[PDB]
Amino acid sequence: VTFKYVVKSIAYHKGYYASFMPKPLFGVNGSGMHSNQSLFKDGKNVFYDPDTPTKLSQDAMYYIGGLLKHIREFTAVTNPVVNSYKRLVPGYEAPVYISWSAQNRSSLIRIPATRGNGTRIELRCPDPACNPYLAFALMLRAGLEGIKNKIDPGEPTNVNIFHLSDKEREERGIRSLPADLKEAIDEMKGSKFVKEALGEHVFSHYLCAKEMEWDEYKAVVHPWELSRYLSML
Amino acid sequence: KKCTTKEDVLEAVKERDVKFIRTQFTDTLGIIKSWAIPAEQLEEAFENGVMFDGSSIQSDMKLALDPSTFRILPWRPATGAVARILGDVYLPDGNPFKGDPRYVLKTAIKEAEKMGFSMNVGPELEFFLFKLDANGNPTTELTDQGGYFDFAPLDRAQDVRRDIDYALEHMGFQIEASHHEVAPSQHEIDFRFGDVLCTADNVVTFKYVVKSIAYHKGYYASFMPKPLFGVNGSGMHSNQSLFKDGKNVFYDPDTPTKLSQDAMYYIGGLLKHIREFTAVTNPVVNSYKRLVPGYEAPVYISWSAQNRSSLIRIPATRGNGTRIELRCPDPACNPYLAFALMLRAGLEGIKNKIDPGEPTNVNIFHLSDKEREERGIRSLPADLKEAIDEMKGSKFVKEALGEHVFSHYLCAKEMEWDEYKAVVHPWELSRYLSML
Amino acid sequence: KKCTTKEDVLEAVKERDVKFIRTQFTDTLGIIKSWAIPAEQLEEAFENGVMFDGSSIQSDMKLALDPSTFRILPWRPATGAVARILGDVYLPDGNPFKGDPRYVLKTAIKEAEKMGFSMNVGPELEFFLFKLDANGNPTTELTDQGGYFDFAPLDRAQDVRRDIDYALEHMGFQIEASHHEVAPSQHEIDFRFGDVLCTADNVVTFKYVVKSIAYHKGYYASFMPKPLFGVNGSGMHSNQSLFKDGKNVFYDPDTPTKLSQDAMYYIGGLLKHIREFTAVTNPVVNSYKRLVPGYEAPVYISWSAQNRSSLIRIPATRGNGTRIELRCPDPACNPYLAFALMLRAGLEGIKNKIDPGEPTNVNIFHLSDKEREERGIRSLPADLKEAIDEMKGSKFVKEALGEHVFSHYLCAKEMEWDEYKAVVHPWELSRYLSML
């Protein structure tokens, strides 16, 4: 939180501008905020397990399973503004399919090769426009619930998901993130877990604000429509 | 002082108040890559190395810093000093990464050492100096209309050139000489002989040092092989020599030309294999607008002693200074790959005792096609596509560079050429719109 | 009315008050050449011919006018009517000039007649329609954003297009259909079948008639094979058929595909020899900017019946309408040389009973390089230099076109390519100035 406005103030005072828009320009990669996280108990890393072939503990597997199960519900929190979904499109570094992998670099959840106390889990969905407090709280709560419920994360996806076909994804059961802010809001509204975690007041206020923002956005006529249809029609 | 151990580097950082460290390395295509590290992290970096993304080169590898390559950049920000450092790339399992061009050059050096030879390279770097527009973007506006070795410029660009020279000297570069070049606003800088690895690192540093100075003084330094039509291009000639037991291998007082048989075999191997890595020596599309007849650039495969327009030229200097100059490369090339391929080709020529043939002393450009066919004078590839096609079928290049680098370089160059070949240039509109 | 004798031409000139007669002929490279003659000189010209300079084609020649080619141009200046006429070129000694493309086509027709065959060609010409600047110079601003077969334009450009169509009909062209093309501001016009000589003359007249109308209505008509990047180019497809004893040779009701063995041999010969005169069919550099994968332009040598992306296409029409369409040529080509080479290739295929191989009914662009190598799908020259290199070593093309035309065409194209290859395009500056 301090970093954001410190950087903005320095940029102004040196004559430039620093922007945190998830996608300011079309045709180039967007800006994201990956979150490396690790759980420590008794002063030692929980995730690290020297006895497993992948050097990852069962608790890490349950954590990944919980995150995969519940990410779709608070995708709205991790991507709060409309512009965030101009970044979550196929063809760039941003992930659009729900999967976890150890070697694939395009998966939603990536496990870096570092081990020992440096063992960590990276979630690549959030963008800097998100509120860090809510995002981190939801991440922690989802991981803890997954650990508690022994949620199995399933088999990792080591292939290029984008190169696959829709039939293959249906066969593998690979779900996708919400396409637009309205879909994310609809998914969040029915989520009992999100309401329980965030509390009634914050839940209701966030939903109302995002609903009003989307309603305002959906009724605008963009210059792209004029450029495409005015001569055609 | 020459820093040797990490303790010396830490002491120098503490003494001179260095605040940031810039790791330095290059990708396969020759672009300079770097990232910053705070001074306090330096001890941990020395102890354990730094993890980073290898997709910048070619996906997580560890960089192990080399204290012997520590140096301080020649500008003084108000906050503190700035320094750069180099290192080796290792895979997580601990094996070195074979995709690093520096590793390729090191393997070439080891291959040379297997036969007891060491290679010294002194390059001649050429560049332009253009003006910046009102928005600071690079342009092609000339700064002076001087000629070869002219005492120009004499306006503030003279101060810019002097500042560039002084900054390079302050880094311990030990420049031999610097002078104006044939084309307007073109300048040349020559480097002292040293080990090939240090020379390549110095060239890589030199490029961005010069560019940064040019920006900070209000100008632009360009390394394009041919930025303007109708004037000479920019090339990077490579003087090389092999040393055995501390003595120059090439020099032979008992021969009429004062050249040893080993030098003849080296030249023969270079002539045999130059076509297969011309693509590496000239990596961009614009490089082949420079390799056209009518200028200093060579387009015919030949070697000479007195004719200075040949592809390979032997300077009149003899004794310890005996050297062989290759005039094909341009500054846009990757120094590591180019030097490694040159050394490997020369060593292969030495091993197989390849005869370089008779030297060509007459002017080749004035000869006839039938005459060249009778003499068997081959030509360099005309365009990047031809160079790629020639390089693809070469097993020697593949085994010298390794499968990974070979495949990635070929794919990148093929994609670039495919993108270029489909563009409609304004020259076509100027010539054909009214005619057709 | 059909004019046959010179007396008919003189009577028509007197009746309709034609004040100027313009000769019409083309050089080796396809440019249209003409000069004016006063009406009173017409009788003397018919009696003795007109002397002129042969350097315009390739030096004193004599032109013998052909009264059967007399036509009146489709505009009426206040001064009086204007007419055009064609003829044969003769050397001073009386022998016909072998450097005339029309003579080449006539020799091809005579060679076909040796075996009793005659050819009918209906071409489909595509062109653009741009706006003129304030100074009346050709530019490249679009007039409409229509698509394939769209009912566009609807502004004054609609009136310009209608005027072009009406003038073409007025001269007696007998147009089949005219419609919008895929690219914006692109239009297509189709001709009826007729003897190849008359079709070539009609195309040559058509080009400058359309250009003149476009100027006089305030627009510009361009025949550049690819004036804009990212859109379809302009091509001139050639539908051809061979007739023997007044019947179509190609049509065979007994065969399952309703095609005769002669048609198969014709297609085989065309596929065999198309590579060698691709340079003639695509004479300018821009033509090979048009020939890139991803558009309607074909880049692979294949023939098909249902797939419409092949180089050679067989329309579903049968009977006397049976035809073979070749889709490589572009409007910038010389119709005489292209048609003559097509005829020669087809006849050579028929003589040797060349098998055309199995048709390709799949999408070639979707196949892999290994697949096409297994299928043996060869490819057209990528650039003008490759086409020139292929054409140089072609004995068949040399013997078909004659030594003089062959040598002059090769020299001109070689000079043009050499001039083009040394230019520095703004795309290179955009991509490389900042990066290097």
Author numbering:
A (entry chain L): 215 to 447
B (entry chain O), C (entry chain D): 5 to 62, 70 to 447
Sentences from the study reporting this entry:
The enzyme, glutamine synthetase (GS; EC 6.3.1.2, L-glutamate: ammonia ligase) plays a central role in cellular nitrogen assimilation by incorporating ammonium into glutamine, which serves as a carbon and nitrogen donor for the biosynthesis of nucleotides, amino acids and lipids. Here we describe a structural dissection of the archaeal Methanosarcina mazei (Mm) GS and its regulation. Like the Gram-positive GS, the Mm GS active sites are formed at the interface between two subunits in the hexamer and are comprised of five regions; the E flap (Mm residues 303–310), the Y loop (residues 369–377), the N loop (residues 235–247), the Y179 loop (residues 152–161) and the D50 ´ loop (residues 56-71), which is the only active site region contributed from the adjacent subunit. Like other GS dodecamers, the Mm GS dodecamer is formed by two interfaces; hexamer and inter-hexamer interfaces.
To next gain structural insight into Mm GS we utilized cryo-electron microscopy (Cryo-EM). These experiments, performed with apo Mm GS at ~20 μM, revealed that 14% of the sample was captured in a partially oligomerized form with the remaining particles adopting a dodecameric state; particles corresponding to monomers/dimers were not processed due to their small sizes. Despite the relatively low resolution (6.9 Å), the partially oligomerized state of GS was evident in the structure and revealed that each ring contained only four subunits. The four subunits all make interactions with other subunits in the top ring. In addition, these subunits also all make inter-ring contacts with the four subunits of the second ring. Notably, although low resolution does not allow for structural details, the positions of the four rings overlap their positions within the fully oligomerized dodecamer. Strikingly, our cryo-EM structures of the apo Mm GS captured a heretofore unseen GS intermediate containing partially oligomerized hexamer rings. As the GS active sites are formed between GS subunits in the hexamer, this suggested oligomerization as a target for regulation. Using cryo-EM of Mm GS at 1 mg/mL, we captured a partially oligomerized form of Mm GS that retained the double-stacked oligomer contacts but lacked two subunits in each Mm GS ring.
